[PDB]
Amino acid sequence: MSQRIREMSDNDPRVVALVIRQWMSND
Amino acid sequence: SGTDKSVILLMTIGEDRAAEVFKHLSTREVQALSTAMANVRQISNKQLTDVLSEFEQEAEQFAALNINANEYLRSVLVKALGEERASSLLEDILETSGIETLNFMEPQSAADLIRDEHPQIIATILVHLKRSQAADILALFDERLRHDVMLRIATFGGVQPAALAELTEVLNGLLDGQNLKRSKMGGVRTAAEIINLMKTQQEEAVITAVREFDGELAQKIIDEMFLFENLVDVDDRSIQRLLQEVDSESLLIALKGAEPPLREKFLRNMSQRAADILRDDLANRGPVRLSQVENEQKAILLIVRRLAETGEMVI
Amino acid sequence: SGTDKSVILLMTIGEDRAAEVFKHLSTREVQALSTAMANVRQISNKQLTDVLSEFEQEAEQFAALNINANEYLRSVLVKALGEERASSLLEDILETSGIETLNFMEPQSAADLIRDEHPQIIATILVHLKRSQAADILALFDERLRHDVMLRIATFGGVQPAALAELTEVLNGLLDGQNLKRSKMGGVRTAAEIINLMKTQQEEAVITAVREFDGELAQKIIDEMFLFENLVDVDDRSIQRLLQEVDSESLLIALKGAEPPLREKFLRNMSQRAADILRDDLANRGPVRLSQVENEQKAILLIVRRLAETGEMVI
Amino acid sequence: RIQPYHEFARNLPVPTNLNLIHLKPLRGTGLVVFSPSLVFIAVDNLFGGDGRFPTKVEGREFTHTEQRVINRMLKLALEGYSD
Numbered sequence: 001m002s003q004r005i006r007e008m009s010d011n012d013p014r015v016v017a018l019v020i021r022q023w024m025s026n027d
Numbered sequence: 028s029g030t031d032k033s034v035i036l037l038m039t040i041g042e043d044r045a046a047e048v049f050k051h052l053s054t055r056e057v058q059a060l061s062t063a064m065a066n067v068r069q070i071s072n073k074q075l076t077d078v079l080s081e082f083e084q085e086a087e088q089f090a091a092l093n094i095n096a097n098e099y100l101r102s103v104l105v106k107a108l109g110e111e112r113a114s115s116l117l118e119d120i121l122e123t124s125g126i127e128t129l130n131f132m133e134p135q136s137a138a139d140l141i142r143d144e145h146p147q148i149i150a151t152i153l154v155h156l157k158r159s160q161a162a163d164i165l166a167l168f169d170e171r172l173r174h175d176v177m178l179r180i181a182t183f184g185g186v187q188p189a190a191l192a193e194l195t196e197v198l199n200g201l202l203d204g205q206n207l208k209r210s211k212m213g214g215v216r217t218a219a220e221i222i223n224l225m226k227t228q229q230e231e232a233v234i235t236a237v238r239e240f241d242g243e244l245a246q247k248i249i250d251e252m253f254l255f256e257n258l259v260d261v262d263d264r265s266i267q268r269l270l271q272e273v274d275s276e277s278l279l280i281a282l283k284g285a286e287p288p289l290r291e292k293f294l295r296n297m298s299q300r301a302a303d304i305l306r307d308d309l310a311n312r313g314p315v316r317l318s319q320v321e322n323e324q325k326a327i328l329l330i331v332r333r334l335a336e337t338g339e340m341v342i
Numbered sequence: 343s344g345t346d347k348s349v350i351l352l353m354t355i356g357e358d359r360a361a362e363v364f365k366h367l368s369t370r371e372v373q374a375l376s377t378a379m380a381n382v383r384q385i386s387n388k389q390l391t392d393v394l395s396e397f398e399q400e401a402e403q404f405a406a407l408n409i410n411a412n413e414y415l416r417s418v419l420v421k422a423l424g425e426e427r428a429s430s431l432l433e434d435i436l437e438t439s440g441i442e443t444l445n446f447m448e449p450q451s452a453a454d455l456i457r458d459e460h461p462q463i464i465a466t467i468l469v470h471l472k473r474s475q476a477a478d479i480l481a482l483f484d485e486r487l488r489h490d491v492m493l494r495i496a497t498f499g500g501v502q503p504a505a506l507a508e509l510t511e512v513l514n515g516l517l518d519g520q521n522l523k524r525s526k527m528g529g530v531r532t533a534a535e536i537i538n539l540m541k542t543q544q545e546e547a548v549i550t551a552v553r554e555f556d557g558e559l560a561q562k563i564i565d566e567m568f569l570f571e572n573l574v575d576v577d578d579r580s581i582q583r584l585l586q587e588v589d590s591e592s593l594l595i596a597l598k599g600a601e602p603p604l605r606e607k608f609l610r611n612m613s614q615r616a617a618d619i620l621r622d623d624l625a626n627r628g629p630v631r632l633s634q635v636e637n638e639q640k641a642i643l644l645i646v647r648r649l650a651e652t653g654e655m656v657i
Numbered sequence: 658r659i660q661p662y663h664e665f666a667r668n669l670p671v672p673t674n675l676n677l678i679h680l681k682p683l684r685g686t687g688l689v690v691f692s693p694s695l696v697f698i699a700v701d702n703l704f705g706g707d708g709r710f711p712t713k714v715e716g717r718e719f720t721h722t723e724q725r726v727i728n729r730m731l732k733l734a735l736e737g738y739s740d
Contacts, residue, residue, distance in 0.1 A: 023029025046421030
């Protein structure tokens with residue numbers, strides 16, 4: 001649990017949504 | 028799976044972050060993720076680390092600098108081709124269940140369509156429809172049917188899924204060639220523009236016939252033909268005559284509600300001391316409600332029309 | 343076996359730890375472990391050490407950072423799509439013995455279903471049903487049947503397992519297409535929203551017809567249409583008129599029970615000294631019960647309606 | 658009841674739902690008559706109506722949704738009568 005978690009939490013919610021959509025499509 | 032990784036990511040980013048992400052996700056995706064989330068029992072450290080690594084690798088690629096496509100496109104189209112062309116292009120770009128399709132239809136057509144149905148079915152459809160669309164539909168119904176529907180809606184207890192499916196299928200069957208329903212071309216405003224392009228004698232005939240008909244839309248067009256913002260194109264003598272015929276407070280309020288060019292034109296048409304006093308009163312006063320400014324502008328436009336009819340003003 | 347190792351672990355962690363673990367285990371697992379626990383006679387040191395080593399090796403993998411999936415999912419869905427969509431999605435995610443199935447059904451349907459049965463059978467089923475569901479069912483029965491059931495329940499001596507199995511089989515046979523039973527779509531509140539979207543003349547007709555019908559739900563909708571928290575959207579003059587027409591104590595209590603934005607709006611609409619006195623009285627006073635605050639807000643809303651009807655207030 | 662066909666016809670409210678059935682192997686065409694009140698009651702019950710509001714006389718053709726309700730009743734009635 002390094003600073004990577006904090007960096008990911010600071011990312012744009014739209015980026016997270018796009019990544020989630022891409023993963024769901026790849027499912 | 029990717030759904031499980033996304034679920035783990037949503038769990039580990041926090042409730043606020045996951046809620047913000049769901050605001051950018053469709054209903055189906057949110058439902059699927061929530062269903063997967065409720066069945067989660069354990070997330071091992073290896074799985075967590077792999078999910079973090081995969082998400083960071085994906086975010087390295089994008090890193091897409093997300094832009095509000097709708098707002099940016101609207102602004103570009105407006106600043107490029109005016110408001111009308113921008114709105115038309117947006118409508119073209121923007122352009123389903125039977126109930127959802129009915130929400131995308133004209134109030135009178137849907138009202139007459141569901142009017143040939145059992146009142147309980149009408150109430151159920153209206154409940155399933157949009158509130159504004161249902162209100163528009165109900166306003167067009169007869170008093171007896173409207174009262175019956177309002178009574179039935181007040182005692183609505185839910186419908187069976189099979190009945191809902193059958194109702195949706197029937198509504199789909201009753202559909203017609205509703206593609207490209209309605210069209211925004213013109214009317215009233217276009218009529219006013221055409222009248223403004225017809226001769227003085229022809230516009231005299233126009234006043235005559237419009238007064239002769241319904242009278243209400245005649246006054247609506249009286250208001251519509253020429254606007255307050257068009258006073259900037261009038262000659263200076265007419266503006267000075269308007270200053271003579273308009274009270275100081277009404278003129279001040281109208282200038283406050285108008286554009287800086289029109290205000291400067293009116294100030295130039297006024298004397299130096301009077302213009303300075305008007306500016307000082309504007310600065311020392313406070314904001315004025317839009318309704319009051321509109322009423323004062325309407326009075327000033329009535330004075331404009333009175334002066335123009337007498338021949339003292341040229342429009 | 344794994345069951346024996348789990349039993350040894352539960353014995354060696356202590357009564358409190360094992361009890362806490364059982365709170366996270368299903369009924370079948372708890373029953374099986376308890377049955378295995380009661381037959382334990384000896385746990386050698388080698389077996390104990392092997393169980394400890396295996397449990398620690400398993401816990402090294404997870405180490406899963408267990409999260410409350412239900413609560414976290416509910417919070418995410420709420421903060422993402424509002425309370426209504428969150429509740430709908432939770433209901434979709436959440437959605438058996440005959441008696442258990444009846445507990446998942448509508449009170450009137452189950453009441454009429456068991457009404458066609460021997461009263462002793464009815465009492466046995468109601469005892470086996472949920473207390474709230476049984477109370478709802480009994481409230482719908484006739485006085486004679488209700489009294490007979492209450493008398494029989496007071497003298498219930500247990501049922502044979504074969505009779506219980508036959509009753510369960512009969513109840514399963516009597517089941518119907520109860521899948522997706524009932525549906526939360528709208529009613530009353532949706533009717534109020536539609537009325538609010540219909541014209542002033544149309545809402546006059548609405549008052550008329552609603553008074554004409556049952557009258558009770560008419561007053562319920564009178565209360566429902568517009569709420570106290572909606573006062574923030576009203577113009578300042580109407581709020582000042584309300585301040586004029588509302589006693590200081592009632593206004594103070596309502597502001598205490600309301601949101602900080604509405605309280606600040608009311609204070610702004612008041613004079614400086616009166617607002618300061620109101621704030622000082624609020625600070626120096628103590629907590630007020632919710633019922634009293636609701637009653638004061640209801641009185642203030644009645645005053646709001648009275649002022650709006652007279653035309654002094656615009657809603 | 659045993660009566661001439663015209664006597665039965667004159668007592669049927671207008672409009673009414675009339676369904677033609679054949680009782681094979683016997684030759685002929687049977688009729689199943691559903692009163693409009695029963696159809697309205699079934700429609701009200703299927704769409705959550707509590708039945709408080711009395712039914713209003715309409716004298717109108719049944720909607721296709723009401724037609725499907727009548728068909729749903731008719732299939733069960735047919736199975737029952739056959740059995």
